[PDB]
Amino acid sequence: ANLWERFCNWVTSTDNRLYVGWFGVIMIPTLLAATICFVIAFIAAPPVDIDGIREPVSGSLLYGNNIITGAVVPSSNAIGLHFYPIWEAASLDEWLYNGGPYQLIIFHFLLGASCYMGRQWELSYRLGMRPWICVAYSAPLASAFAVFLIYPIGQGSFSDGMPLGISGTFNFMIVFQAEHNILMHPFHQLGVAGVFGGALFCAMHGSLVTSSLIRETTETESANYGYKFGQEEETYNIVAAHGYFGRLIFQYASFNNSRSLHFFLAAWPVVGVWFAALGISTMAFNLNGFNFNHSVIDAKGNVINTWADIINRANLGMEVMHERNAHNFPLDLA
Amino acid sequence: KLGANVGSAQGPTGLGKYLMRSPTGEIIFGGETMRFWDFRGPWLEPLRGPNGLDLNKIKNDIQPWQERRAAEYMTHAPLGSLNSVGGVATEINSVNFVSPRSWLATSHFVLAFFFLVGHLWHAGRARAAAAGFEKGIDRESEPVLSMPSLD
Amino acid sequence: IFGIAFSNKRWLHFFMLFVPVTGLWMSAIGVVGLALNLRSYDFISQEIRAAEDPEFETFYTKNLLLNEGIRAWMAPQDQPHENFVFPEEVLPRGNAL
Amino acid sequence: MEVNQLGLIATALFVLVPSVFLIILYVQTESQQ
């Protein structure tokens, strides 16, 4: 047992409290870098010229933010898609003014989270599991790529990447609605069906399994003690849950098969969020939501407003006010 | 054409309204398109000098075909709705346009994504099948049961 | 993978009931507040600072500018009974747009 | 920043009263045989 072999055995060991693995070898340092930089920046980073117009936006707690308003601010529009590591700056002060921490954090994070997905596959293989939990995780991951990387690529600037902050997130959403009418995009709508539906099926499944817990406890104790970790027998009666739910709707709308049920529970929100991610990723290339502005016209040619037109008025408000000092020419083409 | 000295016109932010410097000094177009200064195109390069956009060439050498081409491209920006209403999301119906570039990029991003998913799916499965547990854990031989507890 | 895991199935499924149910109930409470315009609209400290200090800018103040746009541009068509006539000159707009 | 100063105590108690509740319940659970 030579040193490389020993090291490989430790890395791929299923006895480590937290699995490391080869993906973990990339994951750990990148996630640590992203995390440390993120914490330090969130607390103490000076204001950042996000839109490249020498108008620094304050993101950190020390510079007048609370938890809700605070953010790590996207790198400067003057940088665009240029790579801006620390060593490309003349000084740390420059790097901070121009929003370098954002780039460091999102590149390390995206790498890290990709490796996190890989690591899910990897441990599944070491444990003799089926491999596809990582495929479920690809949906939130693809989403993160969409808002941190793909959308900047399409719009030509990380300054349009989602900010790392709560209110920054809201800003990104509102401007996105102004520029792409995402609400009217069927992929976002499928996203909403994905997460609404996923929440629904979450409560549904939870409530049905809970409703059919086999009596193993007295009323003074938690029903949870009626299940013991590793017990071979199922802890609820799926036949009773099926009888109930089948009668709630009709028999053929209910799952009698736990495998196909749990597959459905996996598939619905994962597919939905895949579409959400694809929405952001394709609106990144300005294929935007449905436009029915002035679609309804009367016999004379008068515009008859619909709700789409009201939506358009709101969108116009967002468009004309956003980045109020950044545009010199009449069309906002990116 | 209206008589503005575009080289010296200071915009509201203090950056040049028309012309500014890139982070490495090159003279570039101002406004938001500051992000796009890496752009190179046959209609633009004649205005380019060693330091970027050349103010003398701008003042003296802009040809009508360049004005035409810029107007055309500006009015055919790859922005449009899913039902092919050209323009920004707030534009009214009139112009039936979505750029071929948007169609091609979006289509192939979607396809590429799902093919990455298919890669995860089939690679994970191929691993599992080769090792012999793609149909599930053998009850009589569950690996985790042969493993020391984590704590 | 993640450090912690469920070990109890009953608790797992109860938790699956609890999370979205509780979330929806919380959102409901918030909307009951909005019935009275009892909003979470502002952070007063932010507004005091920003009112006094024109170089102070956060994503919170940015978003308020967006809201102001939404209100002015959508109110006349969205609330026709109010008969809002907002001349072009009073409409809030940034540069160029 | 002109925050509301009561915020501090409001937050402190918000954290401390229920946390302490839990801690009491937990410790006397551990001390039961």
């Binding site: 937290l18 707690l61 970790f229 590793g230 017990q231 | 704590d151 | 450090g3 070990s7 | -």
Partner: peptide, 30 residues
């Protein structure tokens, strides 16, 4: 003061992560 508060609460959460992971109730098979 607010900053101290925010960061403190945050720090407590990270500490809690530590204990919840490494000083958890061991799951015991029965």
């Amino acid at each position: 003061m607010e900053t101290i508060t925010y960061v403190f609460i945050f720090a407590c959460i990270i500490a809690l992560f530590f204990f919840a992971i490494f000083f958890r109730e061991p799951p015991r098979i029965t």
